[PDB]
């Protein structure tokens, strides 16, 4: 046969990779950071509870003004809130009950969500005629929308349970660029600051780094022993974090091309659902299927704090652009802000 004269070649290239990396691995971050002062106790407190959804919240996302934030829920509704007051800006009844993600265009103008309709719906929020109406439905995926993020008002990236991501031209309504490689449901993604790259994580327990502009996969990181549920870029864009059903987070570095760190405890057993960094990147926030949300020293791997507030899975969460505060969503149906 010819397939085993190539699957054995797959094993001898995997190892030249396992080689270049073990040769880069002179020291470890936990050794290089051993000297700096510990971060101290992070005992943040709930400051706003946002009440409105009638069932589980599945996703949420700050608008770039760190004031407004979209959330989506089992109640087929999408809320946009205004954290400073607690007021609702828009309640958006959806066409499909089964939503799973949501997103805020940086500009303010649109939001987007989708779910098991396999569609990514853009919504106009400054409709010429002072209204909120669907302004595009992006069909092409053959699986569920699992995440998405705009790059501007005309472009957006999606990840799907079909195992692919894509970049859309919203006018065109068609995939301008596709991203194959993953061997299982893509679950999260993070654009980096340059919005020239972007990383995805999936149920194949691998994260991948993609060139937006070209379409190709550049690097594949592994190490988790289970679905990667969430993923976040470190602020300088040279590194990123993940969360998995394995009960851990890890931070990876792009130029070192390997795993830097592991955050975990022998007590924490349920899976992470979301992750995100404080403005300096020094802290790594992480949600958990155990109703808690842990705050970590990204550089020393100690657990700096805990945000105990929900009565159900913390489905999602997210720090503000200006670093002022942290939102969390949960299955208990309430979003909570903390500071």
């Amino acid at each position: 046969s010819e397939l085993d004269q190539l699957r054995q070649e797959a094993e001898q290239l995997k190892n030249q990779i396992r080689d270049a990396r073990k040769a880069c691995a002179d020291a470890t971050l936990s050794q290089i950071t051993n000297n700096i002062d510990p971060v101290g106790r992070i005992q943040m407190r709930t400051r706003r509870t946002l009440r409105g959804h009638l069932a589980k919240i599945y996703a949420m996302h700050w608008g770039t003004d760190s004031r407004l934030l979209v959330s989506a829920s089992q109640d087929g509704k999408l809320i946009i809130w205004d954290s400073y007051t607690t007021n609702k800006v828009h309640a958006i009844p959806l066409r499909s009950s089964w939503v799973m993600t949501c997103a805020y265009a940086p500009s303010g103008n649109y939001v987007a969500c989708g779910g098991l309709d396999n569609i990514c719906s853009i919504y106009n929020l400054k409709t010429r005629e002072g209204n909120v109406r669907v302004s595009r439905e992006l069909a092409g995926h053959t699986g569920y929308l699992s995440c998405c993020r705009f790059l501007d008002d005309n472009q957006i990236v999606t990840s799907s349970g079909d195992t692919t991501c894509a970049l859309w031209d919203i006018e065109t309504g068609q995939q301008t660029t596709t991203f194959t490689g993953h061997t299982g449901d893509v679950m999260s993604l993070s654009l980096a600051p340059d919005t020239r790259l972007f990383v995805s994580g999936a149920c194949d327990a691998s994260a991948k780094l993609w060139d937006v502009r070209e379409g190709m996969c550049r690097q594949t990181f592994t190490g988790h022993e289970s679905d990667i549920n969430a993923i976040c870029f470190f602020p300088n864009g040279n590194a990123f974090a993940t969360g998995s059903d394995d009960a851990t987070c890890r931070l990876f570095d792009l130029r070192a091309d390997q795993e830097l760190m592991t955050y975990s405890h022998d007590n924490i057993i349920c899976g992470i659902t979301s992750v995100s960094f404080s403005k300096s990147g020094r802290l790594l926030l992480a949600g958990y299927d155990d109703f808690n949300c842990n705050v970590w020293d990204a550089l020393k791997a100690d657990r700096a704090g805990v945000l105990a507030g929900h009565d159900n899975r913390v489905s999602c969460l997210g720090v503000t652009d200006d670093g002022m505060a942290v939102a969390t969503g949960s299955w208990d149906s309430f979003l909570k802000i903390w500071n």
Binding site: A55, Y58, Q74, D75, M100, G161, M187, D289
Partner: protein, 614 residues
Amino acid sequence: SKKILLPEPSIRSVMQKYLEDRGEVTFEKIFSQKLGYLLFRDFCLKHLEEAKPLVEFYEEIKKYEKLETEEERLVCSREIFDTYIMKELLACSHPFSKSAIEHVQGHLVKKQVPPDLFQPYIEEICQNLRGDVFQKFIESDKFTRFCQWKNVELNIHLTMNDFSVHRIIGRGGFGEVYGCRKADTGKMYAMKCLDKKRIKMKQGETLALNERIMLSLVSTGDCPFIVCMSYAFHTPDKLSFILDLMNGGDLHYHLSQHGVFSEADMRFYAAEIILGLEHMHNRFVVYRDLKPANILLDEHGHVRISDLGLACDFSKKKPHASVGTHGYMAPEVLQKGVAYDSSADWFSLGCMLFKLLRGHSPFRQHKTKDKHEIDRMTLTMAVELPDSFSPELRSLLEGLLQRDVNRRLGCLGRGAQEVKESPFFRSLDWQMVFLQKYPPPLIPPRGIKLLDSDQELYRNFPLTISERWQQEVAETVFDTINAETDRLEARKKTKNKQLGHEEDYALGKDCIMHGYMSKMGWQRRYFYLFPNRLEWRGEGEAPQSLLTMEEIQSVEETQIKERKCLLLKIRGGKQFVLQCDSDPELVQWKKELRDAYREAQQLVQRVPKMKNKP
């Protein structure tokens, strides 16, 4: 109160689904019900331009069928041709076929004008109304209203409180026959109640059972010459049958006061009876108990065949037993082990007629409980006939009363039509007998044990006969109630437009079904079932609580204080209970709730982000 009340229009959501599941939302199934037809045609006449010239044409053909004489038919078929064929055809507006137009023109130019002259045009009309026209009807207020009524129909639960009783009118053997009025409508009715204690004692359970089975085969098709049933129901103690009312006593009681009837006067009862017989025989029932006493008179003197206790469904298994009164049974009936059909009635009918004329059965020569000598004057005497009799009457009786079935009227030939073609009835126009236009010869004057293995022998016994209930409503309250509930609804739509209407919450989403139910904690809310959740509200606000399909472990139906209710088992050990306004609604909320949740749980197990984990 006693008066009828239609469900609010939001009932459609649930009814359209109930109907759709049972295949009842089709041109044919709706158009051929009296209330569907009425709504269908109002929609076609008032609200669709393209459809009027077809319904007008329909209704004009329909009148044409019911005309009596060639003279009238001739003229009115020329008016229909000129208007519905030629006028449209000259205005580029005739939807019918090149062959359609020539069938008519070909008989019309030869002045042959049978009542079925227009049949080809009927079928073609329906082809024209069965498609786009019909779908625009479904999309409309009139279908909505059809649902409002149909809900009422399928939610019928009769008692004794649902009728005003007036007077007795007869005593049967198991029970009595009151005269009465449905408060609903005013329909004048008759009520036959049967004591279950007396039945179980007399062992007439087979007999009681049979009547009801038989009244439901015989009671479709407004038939003048039979006492038919519109309803049936039970109480803990009594079985009611609601039958056409008839006050004027039997012909056994009018032979008692008047004496024998003239050959011209039996001729009127015979005609009426024979159309009553034709009815049973098109529908595969042999009456078997034809006699005078079984023929009742209304207030003007028309008659109908009465008790069906002893009739028979021969469609599949032909009867072979001795059944009926002893003076009027045919030689097949009396023979032990010998099949028979509707030939038993025609010999009985010759026997009962001869009685009206001469005062006794033809074979009864004044022997009383000695039924033996009646049954051997039948099987060997070719009944001798009076000279008094006409030769026309003498040969109908010879015809009808041949012992052997090979020979007698109504038997080897074309069933009841042979009897109608006999020389004795040569004067009659059977159409005019059917329309009850011949004048009647007699216009009546002014007047301990109870088990639960015996109560199951009466489940699947209440019955309502759609066709009869829709006739009743159509002729009494239908128009005033359609005008009534129009006014409520436009006055509600005026009210909601001043406060700020909901641009209804069910639109534009993936809502499956919605509609009022009540719950525990009763509270009567308006529900919205969605694929992944059930939502509710009180009047005035928006949904502010709910229950997800994920959390429902199971939907069963449990009796709570004599009521059919939904039991909703939930994840935490937590029970939720619902109750709807009508049976059709229950059945559809139970169905759509079980599909919704089973199918939700199938989806979620497959999605890693929504399924619940360790």
